[PDB]
Structure formats: C-alpha cells, structure tokens
Design a binder for this molecule. Structure first.
Ligand SMILES: [K+]
Ligand SMILES: [K+]
Ligand SMILES: [K+]
Ligand SMILES: [K+]
Ligand SMILES: [K+]
Ligand SMILES: [Mg+2]
Ligand SMILES: [Mg+2]
Ligand SMILES: [Mg+2]
Length: 158
RNA sequence: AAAUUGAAGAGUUUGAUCAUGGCUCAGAUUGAACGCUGGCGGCAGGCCUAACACAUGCAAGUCGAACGGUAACAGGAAGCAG
C-alpha cells in the first residue's frame, strides 16, 4: 500500500576520550502514490536500525497534497535552509524530470509528470524538506474558489 | 486543423555538521586531427596554416548576314600530260 524509498545513508562521527564513535543516519520517504507523502530521518549505530527508525518516523509524518491527475496544480517554489526548489506541471508522458532527492518525494507522492529544478544547496535533507513544503503549499481550484467565495467555473472560466 | 511538449544532478575543505565558495565530472556539437580497427551503398563535405613561391596544361571568345580580302582545302571553270 505504501511505497517507501531510501534516499541517503550517511556516516557521522563524534569524538570521545578514547577516540571517534561512528554512527549512521538514514533519510527516507513514504507515500501512498495518491497525494500523501512523508519523510523520516533516523539515527542509529547500525544502518538497518537507522533505516527502520526513519521508516517509522516517515509513516507518522505524512502530509496531504492536492494533485491534478498525476501532476501539479501550478508552478511552485519551495525553500528550506540553503535549498530552493522549483516545480511545474508537465504534459502526460513527460515523466519526472527532477534530481534524485526530489524524484523520490515526487514518485512516492504520486506525481507522474513534472519539471523540477534544485537551486542553492542540494543537501538531500533540506531538499526533501523544501520539496515537501512546496507540495504542501500547492493550491487547488476548489480551495481557491472556496477561499475567494466564488465558483470553480468562475475561477477557471473564460 | 497543425506549426513555443519545457528545466535531473554528482565528487571534493571537516573528527563530524550546516552554509559559503572555487575546482572536477556525466551532455550536445565540429571544415576536425591522432591511435586501434575497417564490408557495402546513398547524400553531403574536404588548406581552418603561408593574402607563401609557383613548373606544365586548360579557365573568353564570337560574328563572312559590317568590310577589304584569299594564307589554306573543297568544289566550279581553262589548258596540258603518266
Ligand atoms: K560523512
Ligand atoms: K580531498
Ligand atoms: K561544490
Ligand atoms: K579551509
Ligand atoms: K571543529
Ligand atoms: Mg578527511
Ligand atoms: Mg584560406
Ligand atoms: Mg579553350
């Protein structure tokens, strides 16, 4: 039911009196392929434990995205820390034209066609955060009409 | 009718981190050259350097329906003779 993807595993270190203690971090995303997506970040002495923790957090941190037939509603910009991302809808058959970190998020969320670009820092943790922020801030015609007190036809008419 | 269907990142500074920042790579292209190799065909392309110097052959003639003419050769006309 839920598609899970491991985006990056990194080895970090802290120094103690006897020397360096290594550990691992895992960044993952989960999604239902129908507008729900979440990301998890886990730390452990071992890679499988870190990955399991990340999946556990991702399953709990899901948000909702208003998709339009497997594409975005409109161009969106997202930002987190040094990472800036830009995404726009594309015609059917275009595919996911995006870098790896954005691609995992978009694919588990269920975006099938999109043109994307990452500016600034391409650190995967912050790129994932910026991508999810843009998707969560995307608007749909229903929301726009409701908030403006108009009808969907008046929003998208002549 | 149709003739703007369009946008990917990665490595490297630290014990580790986030940022900044340069360097490096994956693409496409060429009047190309070199190394190894090499079956056929079609279409195109071929001194980018010395606007350096050039053997030899050819790259601008034609008109006798403008004209005086006859160097040929081809007849016509006169004579002679194997
Ligand atoms: K590391
Ligand atoms: K180095
Ligand atoms: K860099
Ligand atoms: K330094
Ligand atoms: K330090
Ligand atoms: Mg080192
Ligand atoms: Mg020349
Ligand atoms: Mg000639």
């Amino acid at each position: 039911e839920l598609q899970e993807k491991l985006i990056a595993v990194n080895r970090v270190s802290k120094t103690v009196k006897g020397g360096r203690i290594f550990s691992f971090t895992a960044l993952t995303v989960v999604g239902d392929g129908n507008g729900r997506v979440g990301f998890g970040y886990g730390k452990a002495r071992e890679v499988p434990a870190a990955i399991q923790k990340a999946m556990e957090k991702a399953r709990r941190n899901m948000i909702n995205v208003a998709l339009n037939n497997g594409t975005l509603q409109h161009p969106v910009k997202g930002v987190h820390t040094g990472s800036r991302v830009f995404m726009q809808p594309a015609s059917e058959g275009t595919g996911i034209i995006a870098g790896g970190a954005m691609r995992a998020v978009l694919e588990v969320a269920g975006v099938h066609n999109v043109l994307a670009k990452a500016y600034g820092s391409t650190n995967p943790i912050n790129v994932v955060r910026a991508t999810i922020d843009g998707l969560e801030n995307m608007n749909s015609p229903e929301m726009v009409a409701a908030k403006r007190g108009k009808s969907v036809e008046e929003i998208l008419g002549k």
